[PDB]
Write a protein that binds this ligand. Structure first.
Ligand code: 1JL
Length: 559
């Protein structure tokens, strides 16, 4: 059926939308071509709607059913707990959209009488009503990019805060444990960026003659069918669940996940949805399962040999045994046809890759540099354009989420993050005197509050001490960065080194943790290096919960 139906009423903004980069003094030292940086607005909502609206086509076969059964089996071992209203409330971010029933985030987190009473009635209701389509709000997402040689805004659909908390109660544990129990080493969110690289590299080497590819499904969420969503629930239903939760899952499936009415910021009727909503708890888990499910079966239909999957929401990368160039290309083409029948048509057609570094999955790619010792070391990098366009924007305006702090944690090893992000942001903090101030940032969707002064410990635990000494990056990685800095108008190496060296001295003089950030973060800047020994604090970090599951659009905060 139609992924969407439109009444005519427009997708409205809930306040003035900023589309241009504010000519600012701190933004300019970072990037000069400020006219190349823009933020999507509801003004392009009509373009997106036209792209994500279509009639889906789905034909299921034996391979599909076979993989589903296999998945159902591993799911069968799972035992979901069910969170109490309190637990689910602690998971609610402080900046989470308030409810239309008289309360907001704060209240929820504070367990106020009015917050809990309503949330309880919404749950009681989920247990009693198994049919009434739950109302959702559709808004145009505001994201930052760099004009290309512009993207329409993304459309987000989320339910009320009351409903969001009940989802946590009945499905948090499910979406946190089932993917791994079901997909194994294929579930990409269980890995830290260093662990993701390792998995890719080890998998690449386990092949006599490796052949890999990334698969980009054209607007994946709209391709998800009502059938896919019930198949997804049937996987959840294999779990040992409390009666209240099993019913809650049954009700949420029919009343929210499979579809529902759409309302704009103005309380107007926008239309209907019959595909995946981006703003619910099961979106990441559901997408990962569905992509994995169809892909695994697509591989068997196409005769691809010994496939290894790595799934992250709707992002997928496969690595298998080559059967030669012709054969690989035909096999790949047969794969896309199987996927197209399973209702997951490609956006960018897929191309076979015989070199690990040229494979972009999760917007990233594996690459290689060298540690002080001269030894090779693989790390995860990515074109810096978007992270840089966003660093500029987050430097000019106050934003709930600091993508830059995220990008620095996830890409600490990369040449661009060490030379640009760390230098630009550490110098700024010093000036405003806020090196202590904790900042929120997201990792695989989950919200986290992080103290800038802890970056060193964080980086060593996640990437190893090498992230402080990598040098001699690849000629491929160097070009990409260079040609990007030119595009955006970012100062050259010399300028950043000079800036870094000053940021460093200023830090070292302060001593304490600041002295530590200086010593390790900017050791690449000075000639007279400093033996970088293991940071004590790092052996006392619990970064476990950081890499367990995906939560994008799931309204998750990890206090
Ligand atoms: C974090 C970082 C680490 C080492 C260095 S370096 O000055 O020791 N060497 C390099 C300096 C570069 O300068 C740039 C050239 C073009 C675009 C951006 C940077 C590029 C690559 C390397 C290297 O080690 O291979 C600079 C920044």
């Amino acid at each position: 059926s139609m992924s969407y139906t439109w009444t005519g009423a427009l997708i409205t903004p809930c306040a003035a939308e900023e589309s241009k980069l504010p000519i600012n003094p701190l933004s300019n030292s970072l990037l000069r071509h400020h006219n190349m940086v823009y933020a999507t607005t509801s003004r392009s909502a009509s373009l997106r709607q036209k792209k994500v609206t279509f009639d889906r086509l789905q034909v299921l076969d034996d391979h599909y059913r076979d993989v589903l059964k296999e998945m159902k089996a591993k799911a069968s071992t799972v035992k979901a707990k069910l969170l109490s209203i309190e637990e689910a409330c602690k998971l609610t971010p402080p900046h989470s959209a308030k409810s239309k029933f008289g309360y907001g985030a704060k209240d929820v987190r504070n367990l106020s009488s009015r917050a809990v009473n309503h949330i309880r009635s919404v749950w009681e209701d989920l247990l009693e009503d198994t049919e009434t389509p739950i109302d959702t709000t559709i808004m145009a997402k505001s994201e930052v990019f760099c004009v290309q040689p512009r993207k329409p805004a993304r459309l987000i659909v989320f339910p009320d805060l009351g409903v969001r908390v009940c989802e946590k109660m009945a499905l948090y544990d499910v979406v946190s444990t089932l993917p791994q129990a079901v997909m194994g080493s294929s579930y990409g969110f269980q890995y830290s960026p260093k662990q993701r690289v390792e998995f890719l590299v080890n998998t690449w080497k386990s092949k006599k003659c490796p052949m890999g590819f990334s698969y980009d499904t054209r607007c994946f969420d709209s391709t998800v069918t009502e059938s896919d969503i019930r198949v997804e629930e049937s996987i959840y239903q294999c779990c040992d669940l409390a009666p209240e939760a099993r019913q809650a899952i049954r009700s949420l499936t029919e009343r929210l996940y499979i579809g529902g009415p759409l309302t704009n910021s103005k309380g107007q009727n926008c239309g209907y949805r019959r595909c995946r909503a981006s703003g619910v708890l099961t979106t990441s888990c559901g997408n990962t399962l569905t992509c994995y499910l169809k892909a695994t079966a697509a591989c068997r239909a196409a005769k691809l040999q010994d496939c290894t999957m790595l799934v992250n929401g709707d992002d997928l990368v496969v690595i298998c045994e080559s059967a030669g160039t012709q054969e690989d290309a035909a096999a790949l083409r047969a794969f896309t046809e199987a996927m197209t029948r399973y209702s997951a048509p490609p956006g960018d057609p897929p191309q076979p890759e015989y070199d690990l570094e040229l494979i972009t999955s999760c917007s990233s790619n594996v690459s290689v540099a060298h540690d002080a010792s001269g030894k090779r070391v693989y790390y995860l990098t990515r074109d810096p354009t978007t992270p840089l366009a966003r660093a500029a924007w987050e430097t000019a305006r106050h934003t709930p989420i600091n993508s830059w702090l995220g990008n620095i944690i996830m890409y600490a090893p990369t040449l661009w993050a060490r030379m640009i992000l760390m230098t630009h942001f550490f110098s700024i903090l010093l000036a405003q005197e806020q090196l202590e101030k904790a900042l929120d940032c997201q990792i695989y969707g989950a919200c986290y509050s992080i103290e800038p002064l802890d970056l060193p410990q964080i980086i060593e635990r996640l990437h190893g001490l090498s992230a402080f000494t990598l040098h001699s990056y690849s000629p491929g990685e160097i070009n990409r960065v260079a040609s990007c800095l030119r595009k955006l108008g970012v100062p050259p190496l010399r300028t950043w080194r000079h800036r870094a060296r000053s940021v460093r001295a200023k830090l070292l003089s302060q001593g304490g943790r600041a002295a530590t950030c200086g010593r390790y973060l900017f050791n690449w800047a000075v000639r007279t290096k400093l033996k970088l020994t293991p940071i004590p604090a790092a052996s006392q970090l619990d970064l476990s919960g950081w890499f367990v599951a995906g939560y994008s659009g799931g309204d998750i905060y990890h206090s």
